[PDB]
Each structure stands twice: as C-alpha cells, then as structure tokens.
Design a protein around this ligand. Structure first.
Ligand code: HEM
Ligand code: HEM
Ligand code: HEM
Ligand code: HEM
Lengths: 141, 146, 141, 146
C-alpha cells in the first residue's frame, strides 16, 4: 500500500534518475523483449532491434507514466485510470507481463544507481511497481 | 537449458568475476527483505526485524554462500540440471514445502544483485542469458513436485 | 474493482449459499489441503483428516469473513484490515496460497449451486475473491 | 504424473461419463469470459462482447471439442505426457506465444466445469486427482519454453 518510508524511498530514487528516465525506459523494454520473447507479440508494428527509434520513443512514454505515478502516488488509480483502459480494454495485455516489465525496470535501475539501490529502496521500488501493475490491470480485477 | 555458445561465453566470463562469498548473501538477504513471507523459512537464523539486521546476520551470508554454491554447480552442468538437483529437490519439495513460485523469486533477485554489482557490463543480452539459466535452475528444483 | 453487476452477482450467489456458508468453508479448506499439500504447512496444530472438528470450526471463520466482505464490499480494505495484519504480519502466508484457496472456493460453490453458477456469476465471484486476496496481502504490497 | 491406482480409478470412471461435445466448449468459453485477456488469441472466432455471445459462438464449442480431445489423449498416456504433446507444445510456445501461466488457468476452469456438472460426485479426493493431471498437462505444453 506504500508506507511513508516507501513513498520517500521511491521519490528519492526516482530523483536520482532525473533526465535519464527516458533512456532507462527504453532499456527496460529492450531487456524484456530479449529475456521474455513471449512479450514481443504485443509490438508487431515495432522494430525490436537494438537502436530502434520506436522502442526509444516508447520508453519515454513508459518513463513519463511512472513519473506521473511517482508524482501523484497517493492517487495512482485516478491518475493512471486512462492507461488502465488502454492496457485492459483495448490491448488486453496478459497480467503476467507486468511482473516481467517490473523486473526489468529493477535490473535497469540497479545497473545505473549502485549507491541508491540499497535493499530498503529495492523493496520500496518493488512495492511501487506492484501498485502501478495493480492499477493498470484493475479493469480486469 | 540450451544456450548458444555466444550466451555460454557471457554467463561464464561474468560468473568468473563474481565474489562468491558476498553475492550469495546479497541475494538471500534481499529475498527475505523484499518478499517477507520467505522469512517464514528462516525463523532460526535469528533477528530479521529490519533490512539492516538481515543483511548483517551471519547466518544469512553463510547460507547465501551455499545457495550460490548450487548455481555454479548447476552452471557447469546445464546439460543436466534435473539430476544435478534431485537431492535439493527432494529437500525443498517434500520436506521444506517451499512453493516453487519462490524459486523464480530468488533467481530474479540473484539477477538484480548481479546487475547491481556489474553495472553496465551486465548488458540486456547477458541478462537474457542468465534468465534462461535461472529459469532452468528453478524448474529443476520444482521437479519433485510433478 | 467490482462493477455494479459484479456486486449484484456476488450478493445473490452468496445469498443462495445461506446457512451452508460454514459447511462450504470447511469443504474448500479440505479440497485445498489434498489438492495443494504445500499449504498444509500452515496448520501443524490442526488435524487435517476428513471429519476434523478443527477444520470444521475453521471453515466457519473463513466463511464468516467472506460474509463480512460481501456485506461491506464497498469497503473491504477497512473491514478486513484486521485479517490483513494477521495473514501478512504474524503468519506470513505466501501470496500464492490465496489463489489456491480462491480456486477451491469456486469448485465448491460450483459443486453445490448448479443453477446459479452461470459464467457471468463465475467471473463475478473470481473478481471478488481476487479483491479479498489483494486486501489480505496488502500489508505486503 | 504418478497417480495411485486409487486416483487412477477416480479420474477414469468420472471421465467416462463426460459429454465431450459440451464440456470442451464450457471450459474454453468460461476461460475467455473469466480471463478476458485470453480473448486476444481468438479474435477470429467472431463476436465475444458478452458471455452470452461467447457461450453461443459455434467456433468456441467447436474448438473446445478439440481441446478436450487433447486431455483424454493425455489421460491415456500419463506415462509420457511430455512426448504426447511435443507438437502442440511447439504450437502454443514458439508460434502462438501463449504465456504458460494461461495453461494452468484452462486446467483450473476445466476443473470448475467438471465440478459444475458432476456436483457431489466430484469429491475433494477426486479433485486432487485431477489437479495432478491438469498440472501434468500444463507442464507438458510449456516444455518447449525450457
Ligand atoms: C508499469 C508498466 C507499464 C506502464 C507504466 C505502461 C505505460 C504505457 C504508456 C504510457 C503507453 C502509451 C500511451 C500512449 O502513447 O497513448 C503504453 C502503451 C502500450 N503498452 Fe504499456 N505500459 C506498461 C506495461 C506494459 C506491458 C506489460 C505490456 C506488454 C508486455 C505493454 C504493452 C503496451 C502496448 C502494446 C502499448 C501500445 C504501443 C503502441 O501501439 O504504440 N505495456 N504503455
Ligand atoms: C533458486 C533455488 C534455490 C537454491 C539454488 C537453493 C539451494 C539450497 C542449498 C544449497 C541449501 C543447503 C543444503 C545443504 O546445506 O545441504 C538450501 C537449504 C535451504 N533452502 Fe534453499 N535454495 C533455493 C531456494 C530456496 C527458497 C526460495 C527457500 C524458501 C524461502 C529456500 C529455503 C531453504 C531452507 C530453509 C534451507 C535450509 C535448511 C536447513 O536449515 O538446513 N531455498 N537451499
Ligand atoms: C480469502 C481467503 C482467506 C480468508 C477470508 C481467511 C480468513 C481467516 C480468518 C477469519 C482467520 C481466523 C481469525 C481468527 O479466528 O481470529 C484466519 C486464520 C488463519 N488463516 Fe486464513 N483466510 C484466508 C486465506 C488463508 C490462506 C491462503 C492461508 C494459507 C494457506 C491461511 C492461513 C491461515 C492460518 C494459519 C490461520 C490461523 C489459524 C489458527 O492458527 O487457528 N488463510 N483466516
Ligand atoms: C491446457 C492446455 C491447452 C490444451 C490442451 C490445448 C489444446 C489445443 C488444441 C488441441 C488445439 C488445436 C490444434 C489443431 O487444431 O491441430 C489448440 C489450438 C489453439 N490453442 Fe490451445 N490448448 C491449451 C491452452 C490454450 C490457451 C490457454 C490458449 C491461449 C488463450 C490457447 C490458444 C490456442 C489457439 C489460438 C489455438 C488455435 C490455432 C488455430 O487457430 O488454428 N490454447 N489448442
């Protein structure tokens, strides 16, 4: 549900990401497409090769949505309500895939923030990404 | 547990730089911190009230050592992870009763630790290579459940 | 999240259960212990044999908690807040086990209400049991 | 996929009373109704806007038939579910790309349908027997993922 310590941990860790958000978003996506091929089926109209500008520009979208979530954490449901319909109503994304992305987001963050990735912040981010996942799959639940 | 020679070279080269002593406990500890329910299987390790206490707990880094032991052991036997683990399988399945879903979790946190330590050197391609291995180790242990 | 149709479907289906709630609760538990042995580890102090009065008396507890949930559906989080701490803080129950129980609750309901178990009510109950699961594992999330 | 002769007799006896024509579509349909995302793999079956439409859709009961076909086929080969499914495995894995988590779902809904139809005769012991089988069929199909 996110304790006052988690909220504080998530805001600080995201802060250290700053202008790299967009880049990091594209990295998690790439990590997910290669590690979990079964997710590529949702992006036929994308070129999933390494330097893809489509995957590049999409990462910014994903990153900006998380940024929306971090800056409105006390009200994700309403803030991301829009993205919920799009992921549950139109695209019909398998709920499991949100866990796979969340995982890739964590490997990425950890691979760029060696100082900030303490076990406390690690658990914090995980809870947070879980909350974002629950909201995006609520039109299912 | 296929692994292309290209993947084989990534897992091997990287794994040979790993500080076995620390990494095993970095994962075990983080598992217990991020997925609390897992603490249920280590009530005897002592105090685990806070991450600080957990990460410093000697029983933890001591066990992590062994856990990491198994991976390297399974890493040099990808050809047959199934048999390499029969013993541990009987152990975690019809003895400890750990739900196989938690084997995926340790494998994923193990992977996060590897990314934390190697940083940039831990490229997406290298990660995908490890996901296969971690996936193969998790299936091997859950075998005695089938 | 439970649409007005789901709420209506859950209240009606639970209604048809009436005084059998307690019995049905004990049946789901039994179905779970035999189908998923890995859950028995939480009840050492119980006699899991068939006619166990302990499993009998526990089913009433489980059933009455769901009844609490159905009659306060618009506010489960607060209503079951208490049970959340007990399942996440003290017992430390693996989140996966809630799915296994939910499944057994559905096989049981379906095996006693052939007329009311239409696919619509089936999806309804599933969403509902999922909501009860989310709340009981929120001290984790 | 062990099965004690006691369990063997339950699965067999019961399975021999099953209306193959209806049951297969009762499950497939309910899968698509209760777990909407699965509808993504059957966009060509036509209209699936409501449970009514889904349950009456001829393409559904027609496919359910085949799906049920596989179970009985796997039921008379518990000795080797792995090979019995190699073909379908290649099909759902490196072709359709269905996440193996959904194979557990069909198996569980299949089980709910069996409980719906047989009622009391579908005792806890009988259910646990089927859970093993359904678990064995789900693992067999996901093999090509390892
Ligand atoms: C917490 C993680 C996720 C967040 C924050 C997220 C966010 C977004 C956002 C903001 C959009 C685009 C909105 C727009 O441009 O109008 C989007 C689109 C999309 N997402 Fe996600 N998403 C997440 C997870 C997933 C997952 C798990 C999948 C599947 C593996 C997925 C599949 C898609 C697809 C296919 C689109 C449409 C892309 C296109 O056609 O251009 N998303 N997502
Ligand atoms: C990725 C899979 C895992 C591997 C490779 C692994 C490996 C091992 C090894 C090597 C041992 C020690 C065996 C010995 O001392 O002879 C062990 C013991 C044990 N494992 Fe794991 N393990 C895994 C996952 C888990 C998980 C997720 C849990 C549950 C939270 C768990 C709970 C235990 C417990 C409690 C023991 C200690 C038994 C004792 O006190 O003697 N293991 N494991
Ligand atoms: C939605 C399903 C669930 C509900 C509604 C529920 C409800 C309850 C209730 C009301 C109590 C007893 C409260 C009291 O008497 O003070 C309880 C206790 C307990 N539950 Fe659950 N529970 C659920 C799922 C689970 C699961 C999944 C497990 C593990 C497989 C579990 C393990 C326990 C244990 C061990 C106790 C304590 C029993 C004792 O020591 O007497 N529960 N549950
Ligand atoms: C319990 C495991 C399952 C079994 C036993 C099973 C069995 C089958 C069989 C026998 C066929 C037809 C093969 C043929 O016509 O030659 C088939 C096709 C197919 N299955 Fe499944 N299946 C399972 C789970 C799933 C799930 C969960 C999905 C995904 C939602 C799925 C999606 C498909 C699709 C789309 C086809 C149709 C391909 C076409 O249009 O020709 N299956 N399956």
């Amino acid at each position: 549900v996110l304790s006052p310590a988690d909220k504080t941990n998530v805001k600080a860790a995201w802060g250290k990401v700053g202008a790299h958000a967009g880049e990091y978003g594209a990295e998690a996506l790439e990590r997910m497409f290669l590690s979990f091929p079964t997710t590529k089926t949702y992006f036929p109209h994308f070129d999933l090769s390494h330097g893809s500008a489509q995957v590049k520009g999409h990462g910014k979208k994903v990153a900006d949505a998380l940024t929306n979530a971090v800056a409105h954490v006390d009200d994700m449901p309403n803030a991301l309500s829009a993205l919920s319909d799009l992921h549950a109503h139109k695209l019909r994304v398998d709920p499991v895939n949100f866990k796979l992305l969340s995982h890739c987001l964590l490997v990425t963050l950890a691979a760029h923030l060696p100082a900030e990735f303490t076990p406390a912040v690690h658990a914090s981010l995980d809870k947070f990404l879980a909350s974002v996942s629950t909201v995006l799959t609520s039109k299912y639940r | 547990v296929h692994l292309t020679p290209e993947e084989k070279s990534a897992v091997t080269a990287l794994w040979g730089k790993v500080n076995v002593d620390e990494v095993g406990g970095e994962a075990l500890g983080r598992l217990l911190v991020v997925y609390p329910w897992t603490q249920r299987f280590f009530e005897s390790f002592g105090d685990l009230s806070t991450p600080d206490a957990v990460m410093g707990n000697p029983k933890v880094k001591a066990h992590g050592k062994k856990v990491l032991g198994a991976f390297s052991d399974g890493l040099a036997h990808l050809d047959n992870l199934k048999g390499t683990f029969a013993t541990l399988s009987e152990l975690h399945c019809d003895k400890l009763h750990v739900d196989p879903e938690n084997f995926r979790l340790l494998g994923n946190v193990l992977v996060c630790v590897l990314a934390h330590h190697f940083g940039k050197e831990f490229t997406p391609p290298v990660q995908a290579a490890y996901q296969k291995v971690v996936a193969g180790v998790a299936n091997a242990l859950a075998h005695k459940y089938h």
